[PDB]
Amino acid sequence: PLKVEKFATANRGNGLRAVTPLRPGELLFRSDPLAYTVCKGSRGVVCDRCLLGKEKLMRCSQCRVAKYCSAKCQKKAWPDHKRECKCLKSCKPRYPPDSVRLLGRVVFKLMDGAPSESEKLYSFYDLESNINKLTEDKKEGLRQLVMTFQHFMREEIQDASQLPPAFDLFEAFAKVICNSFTICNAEMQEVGVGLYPSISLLNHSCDPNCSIVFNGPHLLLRAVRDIEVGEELTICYLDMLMTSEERRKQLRDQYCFECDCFRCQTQDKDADMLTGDEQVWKEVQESLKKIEELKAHWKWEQVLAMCQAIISSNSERLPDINIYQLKVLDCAMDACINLGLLEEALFYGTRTMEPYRIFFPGSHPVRGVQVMKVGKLQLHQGMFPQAMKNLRLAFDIMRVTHGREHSLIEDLILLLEECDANIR
Ligand SMILES: N[C@H]1CC[C@H](S(=O)(=O)N2[C@@H]3CC[C@H]2C[C@@H](NC(=O)c2cc(C4CC4)on2)C3)CC1
Ligand SMILES: C[S@@+](CC[C@H](N)C(=O)[O-])C[C@H]1O[C@@H](n2cnc3c(N)ncnc32)[C@H](O)[C@@H]1O
Ligand SMILES: [Zn+2]
Ligand SMILES: [Zn+2]
Ligand SMILES: [Zn+2]
């Protein structure tokens, strides 16, 4: 039976609230996407279907754009790929914005597929569009997306009979911008984008009582605090390493709302996030645009070189609790992990631990993963007692944020045994 229900809130549209008391770690809902796709930078790096990396992928011949880890995935993806197959091939050699490819798959699922389990509580038809709050600048962008879609899909969709009844593309893209989820892999690297309309009922908080976590394209919604009957369920839509000014900008620009939460009212943690010389972190913030782009395209050598020039600069340096320094350390760590520079990865990862404890309070999946990464690095360098402490700490977080339904927990259970067997 459902532990959650749809309801009309006072001033934030529809929401989700608890029907029964909920405990930390309790599974509230699970869902495959209505539609999803690989994100721009991970295209040809991860499998289109399962969103896992592999040394070399098998590309679809029949369009030769979609890439797969296995014949299993390539064949199982064919139903939701066949029509975009015809389109991507016409397109060739142009690649569309992620939102266009995503909406393509939405339209095909709605036209050709059975009614989706992802739409149990709330459907794509029901999603918030915020059309009456859109600026003229944003509307212009949405008009370009509509024309991009029309061009991209001109092989498969020529008239209104091939869209759902009274389907409006402008409105559809408006729904996509404020309801799309960035799908992250087990390592918290961005790999996809998808729509999960039942999960779209959840409103935002900068200090939420629930969290989502991805296992491939599959999404698990879990409570991360005690929640009373009737209490609204919230998730944090945003990266935790953001100031209240930065959160304000994005929640306005993307989500068309003004956040009234305590953290936003008091600028909670902003001062600590911006410690160090302002001239220096301004330069690093600017440098991170390139670093993050390079990371998004899995260019670890270049990511590392840029991060090293900051972390071990011959000029002024920043404290590790500075959010821009902290992002640089994290990017450097993941680069070192993927270049097999494991000692250097551990130096960076270790340095992120205390800042992550502060900036990811309570039970947050991103901290759980970070601690697991540091524990895993220590385990494999034979630092068996420090590793056990971190892997147990990672488990205490991840038992709440991931749970037994997530396959990463099974991996973590094995590392507890493996590390436990070497010392204890
Ligand atoms: N380097 C960091 C970047 C951010 C991620 S994250 O896990 O913190 N991240 C996820 C969830 C929150 C934040 C930003 C993204 N958020 C969403 O995609 C999203 C969208 C929604 C609602 C439909 C609008 O709720 N969450 C992806 C960890 C690694
Ligand atoms: C993913 S939806 C959430 C469900 C939405 N309330 C609905 O009725 O469908 C995102 C939209 O909900 C609204 N929203 C989410 N969190 C909010 C908050 N803390 N305050 C005000 N509005 C919020 C905004 O309109 C936002 O663009
Ligand atoms: Zn696969
Ligand atoms: Zn194809
Ligand atoms: Zn807030």
Residue numbers in the entry: 3 to 426
What do the study's own words say?
Structure-activity relationship studies of SMYD3 inhibitors led to the isoxazole sulfonamide series exemplified by EPZ028862, another molecule displaying similarly potency against SMYD3 in biochemical and cellular assays with physicochemical properties suitable for in vivo studies. In addition, EPZ028862 was tested against a panel of 15 methyltransferase enzymes to check the selectivity of the compound for SMYD3. For all enzymes tested, including the closely related enzyme SMYD2, no inhibition was seen up to 10 μM. EPZ028862 inhibition is best described as noncompetitive versus MEKK2 (Eq 6) and mixed-type inhibition versus SAM (Eq 5). Kinetic constants kon (6.1 ± 1.1 x 105 M-1s-1) and koff, (2.1 ± 0.57 x 10−4 s-1) were based on fitted values from seven replicate measurements (mean ± standard deviation). Therefore, in order to provide support that EPZ028862 binds endogenous SMYD3 rather than only the overexpressed protein, a cellular thermal shift assay (CETSA) was performed that reported a 1.4 μM EC50 for SMYD3 binding and verified target engagement of EPZ028862 for endogenous SMYD3. SMYD3 has also been shown to regulate MAPK pathways by methylating MAP3K2. Instead, cell activity of SMYD3 was determined using a previously documented engineered system in which both SMYD3 and MAP3K2 were cotransfected into 293T cells and inhibition of Lys260 methylation of MAP3K2 was measured. Treatment of NSCLC and other lung cancer cell lines with and without KRAS mutations at concentrations as high as 25 µM had no impact on proliferation. We subsequently extended these studies to a broad panel of 240 cancer cell lines (Eurofins Panlabs Oncopanel) across a variety of indications; again, no proliferative IC50 was observed for this compound in any of the cancer cell lines at concentrations as high as 25 µM.
Within the protein lysine methyltransferase (PKMT) family of enzymes, one branch contains five enzymes that share two highly conserved, functional domains: the catalytic SET domain and the MYND domain; these five enzymes are known as SMYD1, SMYD2, SMYD3, SMYD4 and SMYD5. Among the SMYD enzymes, SMYD2 and SMYD3 have been implicated as targets for a variety of cancer indications. In the current study we exemplify pharmacophore series for SMYD2 and SMYD3 that show low nanomolar potency against their targets and significant selectivity over all other enzymes tested with favorable physicochemical properties and pharmacological tractability. S2 Table Crystallographic data collection and refinement statistics for SMYD2 and SMYD3 crystal structures.
